Structure formats: C-alpha cells, structure tokens
C-alpha cells in the first residue's frame, strides 16, 4: 500500500470529481445568453485625473460611501482621494515603501496596507489628534503579503506569498484561522457581500473557497493554466471571476462548481493584473499589462468597451458599490476616474 | 465657487508640495538590489560596508545616498514580485567561489544568475558580480580541482586561471550583451575597496542613463 495506494486513492478522487463536474454539465452559458440582447459598444471618458502619485500604483480600493478611495503606490505613500473634487483627504507615509495591496474599511474608520514586507499595518483615520497613526502591526506572516481586505471593524482577512492565508482580529492581533490548502503563492482575495465566504487564487492555477468561521476549503477550481493574479466576487455573491497571466479571464459559480465561460481574444496575449465587477454584474472590467483596460460583457463574454487613457501597465481596478464611477490605476503614477 | 472647500484645496496644495519634495528627495537617492545564494555571502559585503521581509541598508558614500535592498530572506517565487525592482540602478549579485565543492551549488547559482540576467524587467539594468570567498577558493584549488563540476574545463589548476575561467563562464550567459554591462569584481578583505568599486559602477551606470536621455545611446 504505502504512498502508492494513497496516491492512487487521490487520483481516484480526482477522476470522480471530474466526472461529477461533467455530470452537471448541461450547456455553455453562451447559447442560453443568445436570447438577451448584447450590451453593445460602451463609450467611456475620464472625468477626473488624479496626478498626486509619482511612482507606480499597485492597488486601490473604494469606500462604502462611493466617494473616498485609497491608493497605494511604491513610493511609500497612501493618498485618500475625494473623487468629486479631486482633493487629498489624507496622506499616510508608509514605513515600508514596497506596498502592493491596500483596502478601505466598510465603516471608513480604518485602512490597511501591505506588500513585500511581511507586516500588514493598520492605520486609523478618525484619530482625535487629527493625524493618522498605526493601530496594529500584523507581523505573524513569513512570506510577502499580496492582498488584505477588511471583513469588519475588528476582523481582517489577509493572504501572504507563502502557502498560508490568515484571518486576523484588530483587538488582539493574533491569527484566528489559518488556511493551508493552497500550494502556490496567493495573489488576490475577494470578500462576498454576505461576509461569510471568500475566494482565493494561487500561482498553481487553483482557486479555493474558504469559510471565515469554520475554516476549511469548500470549493476548488482548476480551469486556469497559469497563476491567478486577479480575483473578484460577482455582486450576487454566488459567482466569482479570475484573471491570470495567460491573457484569459474566467467566471466560476460556487453552486455549479464549474467554469461557466472564459473571456479572451486572439489579439490579447499579455497577462491580467486586476478584475472588478459592476453593480448589475453585466459589466466585467479587467486590467491588462498592455496600455489598455478592457471592459467585457459578463453574460455574452465579449469585448464591450476599451479604455486607452493609460500609457503604462494597468495594475489596480476598483468599481464603486453604487456603480456610479470606475477608477483605474496604472504604473504611470496617474489615476483616472471613468464613467 | 466654494465656501468651505477652499480650505480643503489649500490643504491639498500643502500635501502636493510635501509629495513633490519627497519625490525629489527619493529621485536623488540611488537604489540597489541584492541577490545570491547563501546568507553569509551577502552579509559579508554588508559587514564590509563603511558609513523579517526585506532588510533596508542606508549608507552615504561620496555625498551619495545608497539604498540596498536585501531580498534573500523572502523565500518566495521571484516571478511575482521581481517587477517591483524595475527602476533599481543596479543589481548586486553575490556568488561564493568556494561553493563549487559543496552539494552543485555553483550550478544553482548559475541558474539563478541566468534567470536574473534574462528577465524582461532587467533588460536595461546592470548587474554587479561579487565573487566572495576569495581566499577560501585559493585554498580549495590546492585540494579539489575545478573540473569536478566543470567537465568541459581543461587547464592548469591555479588561482589566476581558475578565477578567469569562472569569470568568463559567468559572463557568457548575458545574452543581451549590447545593453547590459556586468562589472565583475573579487571581494577583498581590506575595507574601503568594495564600496569604491560599487560607487564607480553606479556612477558609470548613471552616466549611461544620462547619455541615454540625452539622445546619444
């Protein structure tokens, strides 16, 4: 028996799960979506241009008010941008300039940042002293932090470059739940509207669904052939999409446990950095390494819009909860508001 | 027109002034990236310098501020975070000369150097080669020949020729020879010498970028 029998059993589970996935296969969404009319070409313009940053912008996130957004760039500065009037509400200097992830708390009282440093710093915005100060130093990780997202005013879920994903609480500063299912490096995270399930993609082309409370792998997806660099949640909370360096985007449904479609075009051959969804879910916006940001129809899976307002790699892409505007940031140190 | 937003605009102007000052400050400073296999190899030059994630080393030499980033402790796939160091002036790559007799490790260093050299992100960044363990290599030559892991090698076993052979074996992997320039140098026990070589190489690279911007390269 020994490792031979165990490996054969694992292979048998793999075949059984593949056959089960084939069992529910009914029809590709493309044919059923033929009934609904196409969205058509979408003309998009940049209403505001944020030129405060001077280095490459890596990550950004919108607030719950759909007005304030937080930007992270390699120069080691976080800027809170007022979208309506293009004003810098706050400027937070970072001890570690190598920052590639940031998030905005749902209540708008806390922000988080991280990157090549193994510490996920938490900053307070509403300090009575009037200045921004560090609240917690989550330094329990070993690998580089790639994505951190606020789950509540006292709980934050973060993913590191190692094979472990950790859930942290602000009050104590210790790891509550640790997930070790992934084998590669986790790049991006996404929190469902319910705030009970969250997906995670790793470099091994594996997307896994994790439960915040119970803490085990609920779903697995292996439709991609390369690293999952971008991942986001569909607004309804039952579907999610992934972006990879293979120049293709894909949409998965938790209930179906299958890849419903893949978004790609022959001309596009470079990787994908960030992905986001619109309020209605019709529009699937994803950044690309080229000097272009592509908007796809999530249902028909076709190129619906083209944003060529950038001259460098597009890295971050955030969509307001109300869908009033979309902000796209690139490595050109310029952030533009689009709608 | 506005009533209270003028104060916000003024505050934004102060923030912009501070950001511009910090940007000029950072632009004046020069960045260096550390790479190699084996902690002692990198720590040797760090100790030789004269004034947990990445380790930041700041030192002023000849009125120039040097920022050296040690990324050897990350232990993560370089393919997903090497692009962060696109703008670094030079990459200090360290390889121990005495590592050839240890288990194969010289072959691993050669693969690491090949991967770093052929990276698309480092297409216009120079690499500074620091061959550590100079004395240990000379002691090793008298006991073990270089031909154990170098079957193609055929020549006398001496310090000069062995060092030259290792140098030219590390040099050929630079496929894009026209753009990049490898400034190989042997680590010296005497202080105030390696830093001189690093400063000279960085000055040469900066002159090259200046001439590129002029319109001559």
């Amino acid at each position, epitope marked *: 028996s020994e490792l031979d029998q165990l490996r054969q059993e694992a292979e048998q589970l793999k075949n059984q799960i593949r056959d089960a996935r084939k069992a529910c296969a009914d029809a590709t969404l493309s044919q059923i979506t033929n009934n609904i009319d196409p969205v058509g070409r979408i003309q998009m313009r940049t209403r505001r241009t944020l030129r405060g940053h001077l280095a490459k912008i890596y990550a950004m996130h919108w607030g719950t008010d759909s007005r304030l957004l937080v930007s992270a760039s390699q120069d080691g500065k976080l800027i809170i941008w007022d979208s309506y009037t293009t004003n810098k509400v706050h400027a937070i200097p970072l001890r570690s300039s190598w920052v590639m992830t940031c998030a905005y708390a749902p209540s708008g009282n806390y922000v988080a940042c991280g990157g090549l440093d193994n510490i996920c710093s938490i900053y307070n915005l509403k300090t009575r002293e*009037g*200045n921004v100060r560090v609240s917690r130093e989550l330094a329990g990780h070993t690998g580089y932090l790639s994505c951190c997202r606020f789950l509540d005013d006292n709980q934050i879920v973060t993913s590191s470059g190692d094979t472990t994903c950790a859930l942290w609480d602000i009050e104590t500063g210790q790891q509550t739940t640790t997930f070790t299912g992934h084998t590669g490096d986790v790049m991006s995270l996404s929190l469902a509207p319910d705030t009970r399930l969250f997906v995670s993609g790793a470099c091994d082309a594996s997307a896994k669904l994790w439960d915040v409370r119970e803490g085990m792998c609920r779903q697995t997806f292996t439709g991609h052939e390369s690293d999952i660099n971008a991942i986001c949640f569909f607004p309804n909370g039952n579907a999610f999409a992934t972006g990879s360096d293979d120049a293709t985007c894909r949409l998965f449904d938790l209930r179906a446990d299958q890849e419903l479609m893949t978004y790609s075009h022959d001309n596009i051959i470079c990787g994908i950095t960030s992905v986001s969804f619109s309020k209605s879910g019709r529009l699937l916006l994803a950044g690309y390494d080229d000097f272009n940001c592509n908007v796809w129809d999530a249902l028909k899976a076709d190129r619906a819009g083209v944003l060529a307002g950038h001259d460098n790699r597009v890295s971050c892409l955030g969509v307001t909860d109300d869908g009033m505007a979309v902000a796209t940031g690139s490595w050109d140190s310029f952030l533009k508001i689009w709608n | 027109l506005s*009533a209270e937003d003028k104060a*916000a605009v003024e*505050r934004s102007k*102060m923030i912009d002034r501070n950001l511009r000052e910090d940007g000029e400050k950072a632009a004046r400073e020069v960045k260096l990236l550390l790479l190699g296999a084996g902690e002692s190899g990198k720590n040797t030059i760090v100790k030789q310098m004269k004034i947990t994630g990445i380790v930041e080393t700041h030192f002023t030499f000849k009125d120039l501020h040097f920022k050296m980033f040690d990324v050897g402790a990350q232990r993560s796939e370089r393919k997903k975070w090497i692009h962060c160091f696109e703008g670094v002036t030079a990459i200090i790559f360290c390889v121990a000369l005495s590592d050839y007799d240890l288990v194969n490790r010289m072959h691993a260093s050669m693969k690491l150097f090949d991967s770093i050299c052929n990276n698309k992100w480092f297409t216009d960044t120079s690499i500074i080669l620091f061959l550590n363990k100079k004395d240990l290599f000379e002691e090793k030559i008298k006991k073990s020949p270089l031909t154990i892991c170098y079957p193609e090698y055929a020549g006398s076993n001496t310090y000069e020729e062995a060092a030259a052979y290792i140098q030219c074996q590390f040099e050929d992997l630079n496929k894009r020879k026209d753009t990049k320039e490898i400034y190989t140098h042997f680590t010296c026990s005497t202080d105030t010498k390696n830093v001189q070589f690093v400063f000279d190489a960085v000055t040469d690279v900066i002159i090259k970028n200046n001439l590129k911007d002029c319109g001559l390269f």
Partner: single-chain antibody
Amino acid sequence: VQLVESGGGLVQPGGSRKLSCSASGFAFSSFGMHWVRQAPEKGLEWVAYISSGSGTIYYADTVKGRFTISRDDPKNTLFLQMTSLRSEDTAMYYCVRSIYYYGSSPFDFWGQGTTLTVSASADIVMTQATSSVPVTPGESVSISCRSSKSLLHSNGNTYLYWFLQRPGQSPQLLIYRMSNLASGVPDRFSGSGSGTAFTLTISRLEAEDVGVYYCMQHLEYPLTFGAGTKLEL
C-alpha cells in the same frame, strides 16, 4: 487635547497686549485656529481665523485691521495681538481648533478661555425665537431658530453648528452641519432643518443639559453667533 489660553487682564482705554494660547495633545500644524469672545452680558462673537498654512487669514468686521493673529508651528503656540482696544472689546476669549476635510467635525474642541476687561452690514443675522425656556428633567425641549439667508449650499450640506455652554466652562459642540453628532455627545441629541427654519431637539433631558445654547453659521466668511437661549432646570 488641551488649549490653554493666557495673557489677559486689565487694560486702560486704547491699550494693547498680546494674548497667547499653547496647544498640546494634537497636531497644531494641521489644525486651523479661531478666536471667539463672549461679552459678560452678551453672547459669543467671532474674531479671526487662520488656516493650516498660515494663509487666508480672516477678521471680523468690527475688529478688521485693529487686531492681528499669528502662529509659530515649531513653537506650538498661538498669538493674538490687539491694540487701541475699545470698551466693547471686553469679553472672555476662547481659542477653537478646526480641521477642514470631507467628513470633518470643525469647532469640535474649545479652550478654557482667558478674560479681558477694560477700566471705565452685509452679514448673516440669526434671529433666536426665544432666549429663556423653563424645562424639567425627563422632558423634551425644542429650540427653533431663523437665518437671514438660506444656508443650504449647492453642495448639499448646510453650515449649522450647535454649541452648549454650561455655567463655569467653555462651550461644547453638540451637532455640526445639523446632520452629525460630535464626539462624546450622547446620541439622544437630534437636529433638523429645512434650509431656513432650524430646530434642535433634546429628547430625555438630564441635569447636565443646563446651560445656554448658541447657534453658528459657516456659509459666509464673516462668522456670527446667536443671542443664546438659556435653559433653567
């Protein structure tokens, strides 16, 4: 957070002196400063304002030119120089901090104040409906006010501030912009308005509510105060 004023005292007619205020517990550099004086028998009234960058210095119509305000950010202290003082200048002066950004709560902290005494148009006029209303514990009191000009700015926010000054201490901010609660204020307080008619409702009054309530507008540059309504336990 502490704003301790000093330097007041007795001044002969047409005299001069320098009021000082040392700031601690907060970033003085970021916060702009306001000066408000209260006459022994009258209400509050704004004097001058200095922004964070020491620019856009504003002065009241009745004190323009005569008074001057300066700051020294390394020194972490505020200076208020006055000369050729008049009889009406006798009042208790408070230094008030203020930060200006989206979601801010300006005028959220007031100093203990310094006393000054002297030996023997085109502004916003706020009409106070009442000056004294007897109340009892456990009841509800509503205070109504009228403004000469509508304060509903095109941006959607109204510039209204409510301050409460109990006997023996400086005024305390209750509600700013008639839609937000200041830090440390019990949630029982509430405010509403229609652009011109403003009402302040204090449900479930306790004994600590005894004091005089002052209204303030921040639409136009010249800040003004109301006559003040005093509540009797």
